[PDB]
Design a protein. Structure first.
Ligand code: A1AJR
Lengths: 39, 156
């Protein structure tokens, strides 16, 4: 049995921690909703 | 149940203790999450029940109490924020410049941030605080790191 609990408001935070790169990838999406890399 | 707009954890007591299986967004009276989080099951909010209303396994999305309401889109140029809600941890904003998933059916923004599987359904926002998609359906690239699509539904 699943239940939900509030965790916060949805707002942009000024000066949030900035990280992560920006990869450009060729991908395929199957009928089951799974993404895979095309090489 | 609680109907206030915002981000919510999706919990289960079926396993050991209380386990966070995902996250979702309450907006305009509708609860939005990824299909793989709930598998389309009903949800509880206090003494109230939320029934599924729309879902699609291929998009990996589901809405409860009404139709999908989120329609903002990444502009293809600006940094966005993942409002990560990890299991047992406080909601935290992480800013990043999305990459791209290129597919035979068009390109989708993607965020290269790695969080526990229970963070699936966390919202990705633009600078106006609008939800441009949900985090948690993606791929594991060569170096073993996780890249999530920015998955957005259609507002009918
Ligand atoms: C963050 C969100 N979803 C997932 C992961 C991480 N890792 C594995 C596949 C699903």
């Amino acid at each position: 049995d699943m239940y939900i609990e509030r965790a916060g408001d949805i707002t942009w935070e000024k000066d949030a921690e900035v990280t992560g790169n920006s990869p450009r990838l060729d991908v395929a999406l199957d009928e089951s909703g799974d993404f895979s890399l095309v090489e | 149940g609680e109907t206030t707009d915002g981000v919510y954890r999706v919990m289960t007591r079926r396993l050991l203790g209380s386990t966070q299986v995902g996250v979702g967004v309450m907006q305009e009276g509708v609860f939005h999450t990824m299909w793989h989080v709930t598998k389309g099951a009903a949800l509880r909010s206090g003494e109230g029940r939320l029934d599924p209303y729309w879902g699609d396994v291929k998009q990996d999305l589901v809405s409860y109490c009404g139709p999908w309401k989120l329609d903002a889109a990444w502009d293809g140029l600006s940094e966005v924020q993942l409002l990560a809600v990890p299991p047992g941890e406080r909601a935290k904003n992480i800013q990043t410049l999305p990459g791209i998933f290129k597919t035979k059916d068009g390109d989708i923004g993607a965020v290269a941030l790695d969080y526990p599987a229970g963070t699936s359904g966390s919202p990705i926002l633009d600078k106006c605080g609008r939800v441009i998609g949900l985090y948690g359906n993606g791929v594991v690239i060569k170096n073993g790191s996780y890249v999530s699509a920015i998955t957005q539904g259609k507002r009918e």
